[PDB]
């Protein structure tokens, strides 16, 4: 049930769902983050099927994101989110469709 493929699939798909939250994090759109709870769970379990230390760390960092969300502190949420991504080698998505706000409509930016 665990293989190099399952690890890559989880890291790719769920890591990308998490990276895609960049705009929501910037905007303080905490609902979007809460709507990706499963991406956090399945990244943490699928990327770390055997390494309990890394999984425990990832769960703690996830909890930190949600503690910050409950505080309503946008800066704290961004700090926790960035820390989680950096610690777990989840790379941000290419920021040249993050051409957001540079002359194109909001409909274009978020479609």
* CATH code of residue 99: 1.20.120.1740
Q: How many domains does the chain have?
A: 1
List Cβ neighbours of 28 (8 Å cut-off, separation of 6 or more).
74, 77
Distance of CA 44 to the CA centre of its chain: 11
- Domain with 72, as residue range(s), is 1-111
DSSP 8-state class, residue 100 = T
What Cα–Cα distance (Å) separates residue 100 from each residue in 29, 89, 95, 105, 107?
16, 24, 9, 9, 10
Helix, strand or coil, per DSSP, at residue 82: helix
Q: What is the dihedral of CA 28, 29, 30, 31, to 10 degrees?
A: 170
What gap in Å lies between CA 58 and CA 49, rounded to an integer?
Answer: 12
The reported resolution of this PDB entry, expressed in Å, is: 1.5
What Cα–Cα distance (Å) separates residue 60 from each residue in 5, 42, 53, 55, 107?
25, 14, 11, 9, 35
């Amino acid at each position: 049930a665990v293989s190099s493929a399952t690890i890559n699939r989880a890291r790719g798909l769920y890591g990308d769902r998490i990276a895609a939250l960049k705009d929501a994090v910037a905007a303080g759109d905490f609902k979007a983050i809460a709507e990706e709870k499963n991406a956090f769970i399945l990244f943490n379990s699928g990327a770390y099927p055997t390494n309990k230390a890394k999984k425990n760390a990832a769960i703690a960092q996830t909890n930190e994101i949600f503690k910050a969300i409950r505080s309503g502190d946008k800066a704290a949420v961004k700090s926790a989110y960035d820390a989680y991504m950096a610690a777990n080698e989840i790379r941000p998505l290419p920021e040249i469709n993050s051409n957001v706000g540079q002359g194109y409509s909001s409909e274009f930016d978020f479609r």
